[PDB]
Amino acid sequence: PQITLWKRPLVTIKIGGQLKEALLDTGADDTVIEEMSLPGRWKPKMIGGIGGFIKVRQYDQIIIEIAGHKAIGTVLVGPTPVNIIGRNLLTQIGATLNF
Amino acid sequence: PQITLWKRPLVTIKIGGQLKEALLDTGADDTVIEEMSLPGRWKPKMIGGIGGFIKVRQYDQIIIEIAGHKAIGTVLVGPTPVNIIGRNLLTQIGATLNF
Ligand SMILES: COc1ccc(S(=O)(=O)N(CC(C)C)C[C@@H](O)[C@H](Cc2ccccc2)NC(=O)O[C@@H]2C[C@@H]3CO[C@@H]4O[C@H]2C[C@H]34)cc1
Ligand SMILES: [Cl-]
Ligand SMILES: [Cl-]
Ligand code: NA
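ok -> structure tokens follow
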């Protein structure tokens, strides 16, 4: 699709068999999701947002569908105000910015 | 142009007679610039994201040139760690996300 930006670019994602809403976020290097259960081991990560640095849990090689497109990659879990799909997964679905 | 997302989508902007580097950010409703002077009236605002809230000054009807494309709108000024071009101005330059 071609997504205009008059409204937030919200999509449905599927992760762990569950549907969630998330924002397509070119300003995010990484994908950050609200608290949820994921399989496997996690690693620590500090990320810096507009209001400072939070701790998240980094899970690698997670199956995730984004607007019907299949991806497999890193998901950060923690106290984000919105689920954000960052560049690590936007690249996997072939997303570009155009003007 | 077509901008891939392997790296941060940074562009040069012209704002208030100054050149800055800013991120084309589909996850930002609003445009947020590091401390600078702008002309005209402003009012305070609180904006939130990862890490919490920051206080900014809201300037309306500010002309910005974004990668060569002129656009007018509201600009928030304050202690952002990165200059962000949000949806309020991305729409005006005709930016879309495509996959
Ligand atoms: C009302 O207007 C606005 C304008 C902007 C913002 S916001 O900046 O909070 N934000 C909103 C998102 C909903 C979180 C845009 C986002 O695209 C930031 C932009 C941004 C980049 C870098 C520093 C501060 C802000 N990205 C970022 O949080 O990415 C993570 C934070 C860091 C950065 O790269 C990774 O991506 C994830 C996890 C890591 C809030 C209100
Ligand atoms: Cl505006
Ligand atoms: Cl349009
Ligand atoms: Na003004």
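Residues 1-99 of chain A form a domain with the Cathepsin D, subunit A; domain 1 fold (CATH 2.40.70.10).
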